[PDB]
Amino acid sequence: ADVKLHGFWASPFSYRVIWALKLKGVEFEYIEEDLANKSELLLKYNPVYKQIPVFVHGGKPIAESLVILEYIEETWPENPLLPTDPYERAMARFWIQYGATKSAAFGALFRASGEELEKAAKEVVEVLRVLQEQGLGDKKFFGGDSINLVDISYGLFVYWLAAIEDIVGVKVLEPSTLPRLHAWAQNFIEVPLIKENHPDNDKLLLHMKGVREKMM
Amino acid sequence: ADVKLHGFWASPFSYRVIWALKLKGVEFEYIEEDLANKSELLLKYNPVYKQIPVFVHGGKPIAESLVILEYIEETWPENPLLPTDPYERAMARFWIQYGATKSAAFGALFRASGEELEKAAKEVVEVLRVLQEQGLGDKKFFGGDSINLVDISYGLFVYWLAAIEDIVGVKVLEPSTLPRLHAWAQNFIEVPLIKENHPDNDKLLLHMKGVREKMM
Ligand SMILES: N[C@@H](CCC(=O)N[C@@H](CSO)C(=O)NCC(=O)O)C(=O)O
Numbered sequence: 001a002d003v004k005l006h007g008f009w010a011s012p013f014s015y016r017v018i019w020a021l022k023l024k025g026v027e028f029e030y031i032e033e034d035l036a037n038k039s040e041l042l043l044k045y046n047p048v049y050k051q052i053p054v055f056v057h058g059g060k061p062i063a064e065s066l067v068i069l070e071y072i073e074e075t076w077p078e079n080p081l082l083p084t085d086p087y088e089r090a091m092a093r094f095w096i097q098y099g100a101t102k103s104a105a106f107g108a109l110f111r112a113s114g115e116e117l118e119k120a121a122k123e124v125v126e127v128l129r130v131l132q133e134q135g136l137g138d139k140k141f142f143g144g145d146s147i148n149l150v151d152i153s154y155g156l157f158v159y160w161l162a163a164i165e166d167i168v169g170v171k172v173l174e175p176s177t178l179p180r181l182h183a184w185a186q187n188f189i190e191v192p193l194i195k196e197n198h199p200d201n202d203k204l205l206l207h208m209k210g211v212r213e214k215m216m
Numbered sequence: 217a218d219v220k221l222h223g224f225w226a227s228p229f230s231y232r233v234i235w236a237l238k239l240k241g242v243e244f245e246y247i248e249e250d251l252a253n254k255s256e257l258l259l260k261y262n263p264v265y266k267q268i269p270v271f272v273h274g275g276k277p278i279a280e281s282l283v284i285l286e287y288i289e290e291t292w293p294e295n296p297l298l299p300t301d302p303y304e305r306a307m308a309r310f311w312i313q314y315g316a317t318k319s320a321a322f323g324a325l326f327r328a329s330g331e332e333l334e335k336a337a338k339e340v341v342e343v344l345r346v347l348q349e350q351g352l353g354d355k356k357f358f359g360g361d362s363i364n365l366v367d368i369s370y371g372l373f374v375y376w377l378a379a380i381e382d383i384v385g386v387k388v389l390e391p392s393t394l395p396r397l398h399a400w401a402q403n404f405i406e407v408p409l410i411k412e413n414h415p416d417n418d419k420l421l422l423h424m425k426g427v428r429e430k431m432m
């Protein structure tokens with residue numbers, strides 16, 4: 001396979017690329033990186049950040065999941081994951097950037113000690129409320145009737161929410177508080193592409209529990 | 217004028233939009249916002265962040281300078297500010313995102329107290345070295361022989377460097393340490409479009425000095 005993807009089994013960032021490639025029907029070779037012993041190709045291809053994912057097409061590398069997603073959308077334009085209208089595309093990019101900026105609040109809640117856990121959860125709920133009210137609205141998905149790059153970027157929120165609930169013991173996405181966003185999260189998880197491509201849940205929660213245990 | 221731009225006289229973010237519009241030859245109405253008494257249109261158009269710039273086209277608003285820049289490039293494709301090849305476009309977006317991520321180091325250096333000022337300056341120099349070596353290379357501009365959206369995004373670095381040097385008293389862009397990036401910064405400042413469109417330097421340094429004086 002011409003296309004290569006360097007990833008990590010538990011990474012939402014490399015899963016974003018797997019979803020986009022599988023949606024487009026692009027064959028690819030997947031390379032699992034040991035983050036404690038990074039491959040020579042990983043360090044050569046991504047000297048700036050030394051992170052996965054690293055997507056390679058025709059021997060040329062691309063780092064940063066959002067940048068890779070836009071390259072895939074431009075290179076394989078069939079089965080579009082962005083709208084064609086520039087204004088609608090700007091709204092999609094606006095919400096993808098909002099997700100990237102606000103993703104730090106989820107890590108803060110995940111590592112928050114007993115005190116200030118209530119405050120960290122409060123800030124996450126507000127982020128989700130704005131996302132629901134101004135981003136999603138009454139649509140089934142951020143992409144309308146089917147998922148698009150906005151829904152793919154928000155898989156990271158679902159990953160964080162499910163882990164925070166099962167490990168931290170706090171639920172920041174309550175059906176009675178955010179009915180539309182909660183319905184979205186359930187619908188997203190049930191999309192066959194998503195159902196078929198995600199880290200083993202038991203293995204993922206165990207891994208994340210050990211990561212949280214480090215920060216005391 | 218159909219196109220409207222809500223900005224702030226001392227903002228590099230609204231200057232990014234002015235540069236792109238003037239390069240494209242798009243007429244626009246400029247609205248100066250008082251950040252202490254935001255207009256009804258500013259709060260209506262940008263409820264998520266309540267910030268300038270806010271670009272309006274056909275009565276429809278767009279917030280976030282990088283998102284607005286891509287909308288302008290797609291809407292007025294003549295005089296291109298991004299390459300057409302998807303791989304080259306991905307490298308442009310990669311370096312624009314690197315600039316956004318690393319811009320926080322400049323604010324850190326600007327507000328750094330006497331102790332840890334040396335450390336903040338060290339981290340900025342490393343950011344600039346990677347930008348020079350891996351981003352700019354031997355090109356005159358990030359856009360090659362003429363400025364593109366990458367150069368426009370890096371006007372923010374020039375704004376910070378000039379202010380840090382004249383206010384903090386530390387020079388993080390030395391010609392003998394970063395010759396290519398220093399030559400780039402001088403060439404960028406001398407582009408007639410840039411020379412003709414920037415905050416009054418005396419007025420800007422005075423304003424920024426007062427902003428730094430607040431954080432003690
Ligand atoms: N902005 C990037 C983030 C990638 C990332 O965090 N990758 C992590 C593992 S995923 O939890 C990574 O590769 N870290 C390297 C390390 O742990 O040393 C993107 O969106 O592609």
Ligand SMILES: N[C@@H](CCC(=O)N[C@@H](CSO)C(=O)NCC(=O)O)C(=O)O
Pocket residue numbers: 224226227228229251266267268269279280281282
């Ligand atoms: N991510 C945005 C940043 C805009 C911004 O910081 N704007 C500031 C003033 S510029 O120094 C702003 O509008 N702040 C509002 C306030 O001070 O309340 C962009 O790139 O458009």
